[PDB]
Amino acid sequence: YNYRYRLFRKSNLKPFERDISTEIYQAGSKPCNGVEGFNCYFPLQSYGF
Amino acid sequence: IIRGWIFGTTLDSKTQSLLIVNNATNVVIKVCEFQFCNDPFLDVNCTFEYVSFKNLREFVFKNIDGYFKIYSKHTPINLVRDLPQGFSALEPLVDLPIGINITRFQTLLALH
Numbered sequence: 531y532n533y534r535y536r537l538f539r540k541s542n543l544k545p546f547e548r549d550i551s552t553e554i555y556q557a558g559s560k561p562c563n564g565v566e567g568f569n570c571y572f573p574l575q576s577y578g579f
Numbered sequence: 580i581i582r583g584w585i586f587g588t589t590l591d592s593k594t595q596s597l598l599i600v601n602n603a604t605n606v607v608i609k610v611c612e613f614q615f616c617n618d619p620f621l622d623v624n625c626t627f628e629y630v631s632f633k634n635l636r637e638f639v640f641k642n643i644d645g646y647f648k649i650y651s652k653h654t655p656i657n658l659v660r661d662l663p664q665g666f667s668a669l670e671p672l673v674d675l676p677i678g679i680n681i682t683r684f685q686t687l688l689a690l691h
């Protein structure tokens with residue numbers, strides 16, 4: 531799980547652009563602000579290698 | 580007294596923000612994932628890093644396909660109020676492979 535992928539949500543990533551966290555991408559209308567329930571937490575995963 | 584610029588989104592660089600500084604011996608360039616100045620100054624985590632009135636200094640900055648491109652020119656002048664009436668062209672300085680989502684910017688001043 532040391533190998534990761536960060537994004538899938540909405541506003542997509544430009545050619546050779548890079549992204550690093552500071553505020554939560556959430557999938558809908560909720561002001562999640564640290565919550566991890568429905569639509570909430572980053573769209574960020576780890577690989578089961 | 581005018582010596583540099585910050586470019587980014589939040590400008591605090593909690594997420595990647597570009598910084599460009601002239602220190603009178605060198606130009607220094609950084610993108611550091613560390614807290615920048617809250618009220619920016621010069622005294623009278625760095626995924627990319629680099630080191631090198633009578634006067635008008637002209638610059639152009641543009642940000643394309645993850646490159647940050649810089650052009651400049653230096654010239655004598657004899658007007659403080661408005662830019663010169665004549666024609667001249669800027670020439671390329673550096674072309675930096677930084678990969679950053681710049682949307683906002685701010686110049687840097689030296690302070691006593």
Ligand SMILES: *[C@@H]1O[C@H](CO)[C@@H](O[C@@H]2O[C@H](CO)[C@@H](O)[C@H](O)[C@H]2NC(C)=O)[C@H](O)[C@H]1NC(C)=O
Binds near residue numbers: 542549680
């Ligand atoms: C690049 O940065 C800009 C802001 O600097 C982001 O633009 C905002 O995106 C949200 C949705 O994610 C919109 O609701 C806002 O209206 C946008 N604001 C502006 C001023 O454009 C953009 O999403 C960022 N992209 C990536 C992939 O980092």
Ligand SMILES: *[C@@H]1O[C@H](CO)[C@@H](O)[C@H](O)[C@H]1NC(C)=O
Binds near residue numbers: 602605
């Ligand atoms: C200018 O920056 C370089 C690189 O950071 C440093 O070695 C040098 O001491 C600086 N010059 C002054 C006058 O502080």
Ligand SMILES: *[C@@H]1O[C@H](CO)[C@@H](O)[C@H](O)[C@H]1NC(C)=O
Binds near residue numbers: 612613624
């Ligand atoms: C240093 O940068 C990484 C991202 O590359 C970040 O996770 C870490 O929290 C940063 N450290 C500080 C003190 O901001």
